[PDB]
Design a protein around this ligand. Structure first.
Ligand code: SF4
Ligand code: SF4
Ligand code: FES
Ligand SMILES: [K+]
Ligand SMILES: [Zn+2]
Lengths: 48, 86, 126, 208, 114, 95, 688
């Protein structure tokens, strides 16, 4: 790469990181979708 | 305590319901003129046997087969239901 | 002669190894699949399909995936005629329902009807 | 049709048709159909009761000499009453040829075992049992060969689901590997990939 | 309606074979309990054998009961020789799974399963 | 252009966040929630609209075979720009 | 017979005179490729894909428009037929944009499938493609006119079936574009069906946009409950979530079209749901609880009730199993006060005979009628597929239609007799010309809407219309197998409730108010807490909390129509069953299961535990509810006519006005549509 540098991009990481397994900075999976079924909210006033 | 509804099941094309059919165009209307507050549901189907369901108070139901009955037998059975009130 | 007579109905449910829960509590639907309305092809409506009812699919707590506990969810069987499907359902002891095949009625098409003299079937544009 | 189309072998087609007529003429008691495919493969569909003589003929006739048993297969087609189709593939080294013999059985009819003709079938058809429940009469040692020891049901039947009915996990309370009903974290996504337009006009079936 | 029999021409020979298979399993059960070091008693194993035999006791076709006797014989030979482990013998005793609801109300409470 | 939920959790580009009463947040205790800080919509919003002098324009994303399939965009509407369906680039007719 | 003999690939086949080549090939079993042909539209013959070769004829003919001649040999697999198909595919794909990954028609595109089957495999087009400006026709149909192939199914559908005449081809040559030419939206009650008939991805469903893909969706065949037509639909789901709704082919009801509410109520089906049982706490607010506590509270309240102290109101989206379970539960207490929100006149024959509350002919009988009279209804919005059938018979069979009521737009020309009910009294007396028109009709048809029976003088209207039907039935030229008296319903659960013996209307409850009320999805607001006594124990059981939920004491979350196998009866008496597409969300259960568990808690157990046992009970009450896709004939019109002459009621002076006058009031009718964002967008786009 000193002879042929890579193409510069605005989103390419400027700080490479090694493997983070076993560390607090590891990766935890989760669902990226939102809620599917909306639940009905009962009214806050009594029927009286 | 008393009957609450009457159901008459029959067929439009089967011959065994014919006497039951002979009831409906002959003695039904005056019957409806005798018990105006009694639901008498007439239901037809493609191949059902003739039948008479009688619902009483608190869900008790009795069944009377009307197969190959004449019109006079049909109204005799119907008067038995109307005068039973069991 | 080496042949014996058995007149009882076929019943192989004890040999298939399927648990009884998926034998007596399942409803098998035998049907000709409907044509997809987004296409005009009719090649998918030539054979009878037998399938089962749909049970519960819920969400995985980890990734939100579709988890199930029904093993017969992806089972679809293909039969040439209705009677083969009925015989296969009765042999395996599955309670079944069958719906008749719906074919399109033959229409009457005429290109000249777009240019009628006194009928309402004139086209406003072509 | 030169570069991208597979060339035909007409002489092999003629020879296989002649030999099929020869076999169907020698044994009219058992054979039911003789066909040759477009890529020159000979299939002889016979009655199941002649599964022992016919193979023996193909093992011993001087014009056949099908000494090798290449394969033994069962095919499950639920739309037929005889849902199991049993396929024997034979190879003749003397004449450098291959033949296929097909019989039909259902779940309850037993089959005469072809161990006395070909010894390799002693495992092959046994596997068929372990995958299909097709009983082979007069087999020396018939049992399961691929499934687990407590396995119930025959997996290669088309009414058997992809995942089974049980699955294994280790339980620390009983200190044992135990079986429980299957609960998949991801359901197997079934894909309907069949196009609604007819692809091959030559294989079009007559209507009803 | 004439079919090729497997072993028995009628129901009598099939019932005879069922009797032999039950006799062999009843003789086998104490040896299975002692050899595999199971935590069950001989009474529990014999009651389990009787439970399977009564569970599979509503058939009337000679070929079906013939195949059932054949499969029971295969399981018996898998138990006679040490091919099954402790786990395969204890597959018949479902201890780990929770007992499923039976009445309408509990099945209504737990989910949508009929 | 990331934002921070009042519970202290980062919101992803899909809008996903865990509620305060959700127990699944216990999977992030002692670890970190992995989010991408480069939002594609924000990054494509900064791209200037290219002015061209033709009725239709062709887009392939640049690089030829390294881009998307080539598409043709009509620029007759003077009110709004013509956005590419793949790359999101927009064009405008200068007349 | 007058059949002629033609040949397809050397195989002989008899056809009727006037049959096209395409229809003969379909008869022998061969599907000729097509783009512009549609069996429910007029023949255009412009796509030129159906070009086939007749033997000993040196010119290919368009099979979609060419009538067969005697002795013609059709060669569907010949060399020049395949050459013509390849050339037409090349011309069609010359200007098509490379949009398949970003197009919703991918995986179910007709153009893709016929390009794979009958087309070539490479392109010779080295020039530049055209680009078409996109159009806007409303928030229902997403429009990408660059993908259009100018097949002109748009204009044919909008002119022959929808009856709108707002689409057209503007321009000439390669610049010809399909559109409205102005900033106009295509808002009809059957607009979304164009998304079904576009063979390319030019017109797509805007709510469905970029959500799923056809190969990964599971199809469940179910029945629509948005109206009383009973349209057969396919629910396409994906991983336990409903994605879209498509029509099903059924030649007797909804041939291949559905209304827009049916196609776009699913997004409201997945909103504002009831998931857990709720009870009133010490503060008077509805808080979540278990099934045991709520069912114990309801059973403890019901056990103290007897006689007429407990009643029930059935909603519009209730299955027959729930209705019979609630009827048996209330009859175990000896309560006959089971009511429905929709009002039907019970005077005279009542719900005894099935002839006087059914569409007695068929849906398809409009194709056989010659004079149709519509009384006090707007069939365009109350039952849009019935209006489509009437329009089809008007276009093809030269039907004559007259209407009594408000002069609504019905997408065909009719004879507006007036809006007063008194003109009906003129029809039976013969003082009107339309009395002579009905007398001279061979197959007359009188349709009375169920919305006209909601008035206080509904019994008098029904008596007058039945008098007209019996006057023009026995005296005029009616064969006897033809049924004249027809009632069009607008509620999916009304016919099944009337078959089971429910009391129509809520007047029985207003007569003597009960101290405990059951609301089986009663979101119509017919009975409020003002009419009920001071301490009324209202129990609500439904899938959506819209109107009846905030006034209830205990809320029992039920299942929707896509979440259970449920029996519904349409307006012509044909029983049908739905299938389980997805499962109910949260702790929501099936309705009859809820009622059976409630009877189990109270010690009054109903004698059924599984679904088939409830269906056997349904057969016991009325057998025609268990025969599916079968229309049992109704009889004894004369007996109902004789019974209707007993009690004389007078018509009111108010003119007949339907509740749905424009397309604005069509989109929101039930609780599912009122909780829908797509319906809100449609109403906003209409009103602006
Ligand atoms: S309409 Fe068909 S051919 Fe055109 S982009 Fe969509 S999938 Fe491709
Ligand atoms: S938009 Fe679709 S249906 Fe309309 S003319 Fe074009 S290809 Fe045909
Ligand atoms: S289908 Fe005949 S020309 Fe289009
Ligand atoms: K489309
Ligand atoms: Zn681009």
């Amino acid at each position: 790469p000193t002879v042929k540098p890579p193409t510069a991009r605005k989103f390419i990481w400027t700080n490479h990181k090694f493997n983070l397994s076993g560390t607090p900075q590891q990766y935890v999976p989760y669902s990226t979708t939102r809620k599917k079924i909306q639940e009905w909210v009962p009214p806050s006033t009594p029927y009286k | 305590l008393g009957l609450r509804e009457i159901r008459i099941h029959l067929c439009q094309r089967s011959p065994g319901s014919q006497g039951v059919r002979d009831f409906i165009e002959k003695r039904y209307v005056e019957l409806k003129k005798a018990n105006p507050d009694l639901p008498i549901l007439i239901r037809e189907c493609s191949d059902v046997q003739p039948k008479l369901w009688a619902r009483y108070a608190f869900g008790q139901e009795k069944n009377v087969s009307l197969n190959n009955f004449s019109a006079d037998q049909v109204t005799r059975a119907l008067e038995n239901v109307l005068s039973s009130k069991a | 002669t080496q042949l014996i007579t058995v007149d009882e109905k076929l019943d192989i449910t004890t040999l298939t190894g399927v648990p009884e829960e998926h034998i007596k509590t399942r409803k098998a639907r035998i049907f000709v699949p409907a044509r997809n309305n987004m296409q005009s092809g009719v090649n998918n409506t030539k054979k009878w399909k037998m399938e089962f009812d749909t049970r519960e699919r819920w969400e995985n707590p980890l990734m939100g995936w579709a988890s199930t506990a029904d093993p017969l969810s992806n089972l679809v069987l293909t039969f040439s005629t209705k009677e083969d499907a009925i015989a296969f359902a009765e042999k395996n002891g599955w309670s079944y329902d069958v719906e008749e095949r719906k074919v399109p009625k033959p229409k009457s098409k005429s290109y000249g009807a777009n240019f009628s003299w006194n009928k309402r079937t004139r086209v406003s544009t072509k | 049709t030169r570069p991208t189309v597979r060339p035909r072998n007409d002489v092999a087609h003629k020879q296989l048709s002649a030999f099929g007529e020869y076999v169907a003429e020698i044994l009219p008691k058992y054979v039911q159909q003789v066909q040759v495919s477009c890529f020159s493969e000979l299939e002889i569909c016979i009655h199941p009761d002649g599964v022992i003589p016919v193979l023996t003929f193909l093992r011993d006739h001087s014009n056949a000499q099908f000494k090798s048993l290449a394969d033994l297969t069962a095919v499950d087609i639920p739309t037929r009453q005889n849902r199991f189709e049993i396929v024997y593939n034979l190879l003749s080294l003397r004449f450098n040829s291959r033949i296929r013999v097909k019989t039909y059985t259902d779940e309850l009819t037993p089959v005469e075992s072809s161990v006395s003709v070909y010894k390799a079938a002693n495992w092959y058809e046994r596997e068929i049992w372990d995958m299909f429940g097709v009983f082979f009469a007069n087999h020396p040692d018939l049992r399961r060969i691929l499934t687990d020891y407590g396995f119930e049901g025959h997996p290669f039947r088309k009414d058997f689901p992809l995942s089974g009915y049980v699955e294994l996990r280790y339980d620390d309370e009983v200190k044992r590997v135990v079986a429980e009903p299957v609960e998949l974290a991801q359901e197997f996504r079934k894909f309907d990939l069949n196009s609604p337009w007819e692809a091959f006009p030559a294989y079009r079936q007559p209507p009803e | 309606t004439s079919v090729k029999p497997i072993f028995s021409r009628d129901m009598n020979e099939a019932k005879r074979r069922v009797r032999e298979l039950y006799r062999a399993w009843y003789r086998e059960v104490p040896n299975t309990v002692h050899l595999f070091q199971l935590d069950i008693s001989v009474k529990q194993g014999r009651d389990k054998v009787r439970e399977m035999f009564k569970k599979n006791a509503h058939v009337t076709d000679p070929r079906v009961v013939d195949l059932l006797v054949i499969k029971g014989k295969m399981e018996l030979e898998e138990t006679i020789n040490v091919w099954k482990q402790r786990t395969h013998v204890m597959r018949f005793f479902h201890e780990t799974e929770a007992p499923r609801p039976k009445d309408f109300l509990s099945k209504f409470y737990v989910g949508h399963d009929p | 252009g990331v934002r921070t939920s009042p519970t202290g959790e980062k919101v992803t580009h899909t809008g996903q966040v865990y509620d305060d009463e959700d127990y699944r947040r216990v999977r992030f205790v002692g670890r970190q929630k992995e989010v991408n800080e480069n939002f594609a919509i924000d990054l494509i919003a900064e791209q200037p609209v290219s002015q061209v002098g033709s009725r239709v324009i062709s887009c392939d994303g640049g690089g030829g075979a390294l881009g998307h399939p080539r598409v043709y965009i009509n620029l007759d509407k003077e009110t709004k720009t013509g956005t590419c369906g793949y790359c999101g680039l927009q064009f405008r007719q200068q007349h | 017979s007058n059949l002629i003999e033609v040949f397809v690939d050397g195989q002989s086949v008899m056809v009727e005179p006037g049959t096209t080549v395409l229809q003969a090939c379909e008869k022998v079993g061969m599907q000729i490729p097509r783009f512009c042909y549609h069996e429910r539209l007029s023949v255009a013959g412009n796509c030129r894909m159906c070009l086939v070769e007749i033997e000993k004829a040196p010119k290919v003919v368009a099979a979609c428009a060419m009538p067969v001649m005697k002795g013609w040999n059709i060669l569907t697999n010949s060399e020049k037929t395949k050459k013509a198909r390849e050339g037409v595919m090349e011309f069609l794909l010359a200007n098509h944009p490379l949009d398949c990954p970003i197009c919703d028609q991918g995986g179910e595109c007709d153009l893709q499938d016929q390009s794979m089957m009958f087309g070539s495999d490479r392109s010779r087009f080295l020039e530049g493609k055209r680009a078409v400006e996109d159009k806007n026709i409303g928030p229902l149909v997403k429009t990408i006119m660059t993908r259009c192939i100018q097949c002109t199914r748009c204009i044919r559908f909008a002119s022959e079936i929808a009856g709108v005449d707002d689409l057209g081809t503007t321009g000439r040559g390669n610049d010809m574009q399909v559109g409205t030419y102005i900033e106009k939206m295509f808002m009809s009650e059957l607009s979304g069906n164009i998304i079904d008939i576009c063979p390319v991805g030019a017109l797509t469903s805007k709510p469905y946009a970029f959500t799923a893909r056809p190969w990964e969706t599971r199809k469940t065949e179910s029945i629509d409950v948005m109206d009383a037509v009973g349209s057969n639909i396919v629910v396409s789901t994906r991983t336990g979530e409903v994605m879209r709704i498509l029509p099903r082919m059924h030649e007797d009801i909804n041939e291949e079209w559905i209304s827009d509410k049916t196609r776009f109520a699913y997004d409201g089906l997945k909103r504002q749901r009831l998931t857990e049982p709720m009870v009133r706490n010490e503060k008077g607010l509805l808080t979540h609880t278990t099934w045991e506590d709520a069912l114990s509270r309801v059973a403890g309240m019901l056990q103290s009730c007897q006689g007429n102290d407990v009643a029930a109101i059935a909603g519009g989206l209730v299955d027959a199993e729930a209705l019979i379970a609630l009827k048996d539960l209330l009859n175990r207490v000896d309560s006959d006060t089971l009511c429905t929100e929709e009002v039907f006149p019970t005077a005279g024959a009542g719900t005894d005979l099935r002839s006087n509350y059914l569409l007695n002919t068929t849906i398809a009988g409009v194709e056989e009628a010659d004079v149709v009279l519509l009384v006090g209804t707007n069939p365009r919005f109350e039952a849009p597929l019935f209006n489509a059938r009437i329009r089809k018979s008007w276009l093809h069979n030269d039907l004559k239609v007259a209407l009594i009521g408000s002069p609504v737009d019905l997408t065909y020309r009719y004879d507006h007799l007036g809006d007063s009910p008194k003109i009906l009294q003129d029809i039976a007396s013969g003082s009107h010309p339309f009395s002579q028109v009905l007398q001279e009709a061979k197959k007359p048809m009188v349709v009375l809407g169920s919305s006209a029976l909601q008035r206080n003088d509904g019994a008098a209207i029904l008596a007058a219309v039945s008098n007209i039907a019996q006057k023009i039935r026995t005296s005029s030229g009616v064969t006897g197998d033809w049924k004249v008296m027809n009632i069009l319903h607008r509620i999916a659960s009304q016919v099944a409730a009337l078959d089971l013996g429910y009391k129509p209307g809520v007047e029985a409850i207003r007569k003597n108010p009960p101290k405990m009320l059951f609301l089986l999805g009663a979101d119509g607001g017919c009975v409020t807490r003002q009419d009920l006594p001071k301490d009324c124990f209202i129990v609500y059981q439904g899938h959506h909390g819209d109107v009846g939920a905030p006034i209830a004491d205990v809320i029992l979350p039920g299942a929707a129509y896509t979440e259970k196998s449920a029996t519904y009866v349409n307006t012509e008496g044909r029983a049908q069953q739905t299938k389980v597409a997805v499962m109910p969300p949260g702790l929501a259960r099936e309705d009859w299961k809820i009622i059976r568990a409630l009877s189990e808690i109270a010690g009054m157990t109903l004698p059924y535990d599984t679904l088939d046992q409830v269906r056997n009970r349904l057969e016991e009450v009325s057998p025609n509810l268990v025969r599916y896709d079968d229309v049992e004939g109704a009889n004894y019109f004369q007996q109902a006519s004789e019974l209707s002459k007993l009690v004389n009621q007078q018509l009111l002076a108010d003119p007949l006005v339907p509740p749905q006058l424009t397309i604005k009031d069509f989109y929101m009718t039930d609780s599912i549509s009122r909780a829908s964002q797509t319906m809100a967008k449609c109403v906003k786009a209409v009103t602006e």
